[PDB]
Amino acid sequence: TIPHLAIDPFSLDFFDDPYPDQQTLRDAGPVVYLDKWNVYGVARYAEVHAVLNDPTTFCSSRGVGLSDFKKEKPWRPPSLILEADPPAHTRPRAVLSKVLSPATMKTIRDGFAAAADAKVDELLQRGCIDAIADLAEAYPLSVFPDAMGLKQEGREHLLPYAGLVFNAFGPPNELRQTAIERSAPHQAYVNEQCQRPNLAPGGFGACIHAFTDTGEITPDEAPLLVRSLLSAGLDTTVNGIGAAVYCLARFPGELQRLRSDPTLARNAFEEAVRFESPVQTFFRTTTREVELGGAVIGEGEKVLMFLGSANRDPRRWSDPDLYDITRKTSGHVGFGSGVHMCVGQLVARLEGEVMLSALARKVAAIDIDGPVKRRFNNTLRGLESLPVKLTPA
Ligand code: HEM
Ligand SMILES: CCOc1cccc(C(=O)O)c1
Ligand SMILES: [Cl-]
């Protein structure tokens, strides 16, 4: 009764244009079976939202990738928060919440916004730039590693390590095999910076290590919690900011509405997160036999959630293929939903807002003037190169 589909959502053809296949996944039924990897799939908004908010049945401690930790060894020690279930997930999550707290954003917002204005001012002096390397990558690299309290040496390992982690969530294809095949130097750097003496005072890293005496985490848990921020804190904001610029480059009408009201910068970034969904997919594992969308799913089965497809489901969104900076984006699953919803979404929204704010006040037009190249990742959707000409306001 469950439709079987041969679509490979982790193929280069799928990444190149996933929207026709995503509607096919949605319309085939509420629950599908992907014969390519022997997993269940949910593509409509309702089932994606239901699975995310049922952590007891659709657990994360057996891996949020394709690999089942009950069957295969994890390529790295499991994350204490992303790949953990309640109650073991509760207190590590609370520490990262207080480290990336609303009170923390007040201390870094001015420096984050000043670096965004300075970056746009610098890019306008060049004219024709690469919105990926010179903006989507250059800006987060100019604020986040310093906010983490990282030293200067070795920062070129951060993005390769992140692309490795998100490629590792995928199936054992060549993208995943090649990533782990080039991995030992990157984890050696990242794991070393997770140690307390290597994190500058005042940064997120030192703040995590200071939370070890409250009884919420132990000193031996702090390095892996810092590893979470070094795994997910940079590459997500790169593809999130690269998505917003790509949207404003393809939709000049929305760029003109943003210029007229720069206070829309926060929602313009949030709508970009829904439109592109830089975090495309995540898995869950059934801890029991469960009925979902008229389909019964056995225990220990992998269920693939299409977050990007749920953000474009016409059963939930009106004109889902339209970029609307004034759309009420509340409910989108670009940051997840439930107990695992993005704990660093305040940092991500701060970086996105101040960057779109700088563009809104300083840029009059963003025109693509070069060949667009896509970056292929088993989890992340984003561009490799985006040549644009920036016209000063
Ligand atoms: C555009 C930017 C971002 C997007 C689209 C995004 C997306 C997501 C999503 C979809 C989840 C849910 C994962 C799941 O339910 O299995 C998540 C969780 C998480 N994110 Fe973000 N994220 C972003 C930025 C960040 C930043 C800036 C940080 C840290 C500084 C971060 C750290 C984390 C962590 C640690 C988790 C695990 C939370 C948990 O398991 O309770 N992310 N993110
Ligand atoms: C989508 C953000 O979620 C992530 C991604 C990669 C690593 C981790 C972690 O907890 O180390 C979390
Ligand atoms: Cl590692």
What is the SS3 string spanning 193-227?
Answer: HCCHHHCCCCCHHHHHHHHHHCCCCCCCCHHHHHH
CA distance 251 to 227: 37
Q: Is 342 annotated as a binding residue?
A: yes
Q: Is residue 282 lining ligand 1, measured as CB closer than 6 Å?
A: yes
Per-residue CA distances from 392 to 99, 124, 127, 281 (Å): 37, 6, 9, 37
Choose which CATH entry (1.20.120.1770, 1.10.540.10, 1.10.1200.10, 1.10.630.10) describes domain 1-393: 1.10.630.10
CA 159 to chain centre: 13
| Closest by Cα among 294, 251, 299, 298 to 272 | 251
Amino acid identity of 306? F
Q: Retrieve residue 192's tokens.
A: 């070393």
Taking the centre of ligand 1 as the mean of its atom positions, its distance from the CA of residue 344, in whole angstroms, is 6
Q: Which is it for strands 281-286 and 128-130: parallel, antiparallel or unpaired?
A: unpaired
Residue 320 in contact with ligand 1 by CB distance below 6 A: no
- The answer to whether 182 is annotated as binding is no
Residue 111 is encoded by which pair of tokens?
């420096």
Half-sphere exposure of 255 (CA within 13 A, CB side): 20
- In 211-251, alpha helices (H): 222-232, 235-250
Question: 267 Cβ partners below 8 Å, 6+ apart?
Answer: 325, 326, 327, 329
Method by which the coordinates were obtained: X-ray
Ligand 1 nearest atom to the CA of residue 96, by list position: 35
* Widest CA span in the chain: 60
Closest by Cα among 330, 240, 320 to 279: 240
Nearest Cα residue to 306 out of 12, 27, 2: 27
Report the distance separating Cα 351 and Cα 66, nearest Å: 31
Segments making up each domain of the chain, as ranges: 1-393
- Please give the Cα distance from 74 to 59 (Å, whole number): 16
CA 231 to ligand 2 centroid distance, Å: 6
Could you tell me the two tokens for 241?
């900011």
49 is in an annotated binding site: no
Tokens 């829904």, residue located:
274
* 3-state secondary structure (DSSP) of residue 211: helix
| Tokens describing residue 107 | 């201390």
383: which strand partners?
374
Q: For residue 150, how many C-alpha atoms fall within 13 Å in the half-sphere facing its CB?
A: 27
Ramachandran region of residue 42, left (φ > 0), alpha (ψ -120 to 50) or beta? Answer: beta
- For residues 332 and 273, the answer to whether their CB atoms sit within 8 Å is yes
Please indicate if the annotation marks 375 as binding a ligand. no
Positive or negative, the Cα torsion across 130, 250, 379, 350? positive
Q: Cα(373) to centroid of ligand 1, in Å? A: 25
Q: How far is the CA of 239 from the centre of ligand 1 (A)?
A: 13
C-alpha 248/C-alpha 259 separation (Å) is 11
Strand partners, 187: none
What does the DSSP 8-state code read for residue 383? E
Among protein residues, the one whose CA lies closest to atom 6 of ligand 2:
232
Burial 248-276, CB ≥16 within 10 A → b, else e: bbebeebbebbbeebebbbbbbbbbbbbb
| Residues whose CB falls within 8 Å of the CB of residue 228, separated by 6 or more in sequence, listed in order | 79, 80, 81, 82, 96
The data reach a resolution, in angstroms, of 2.4
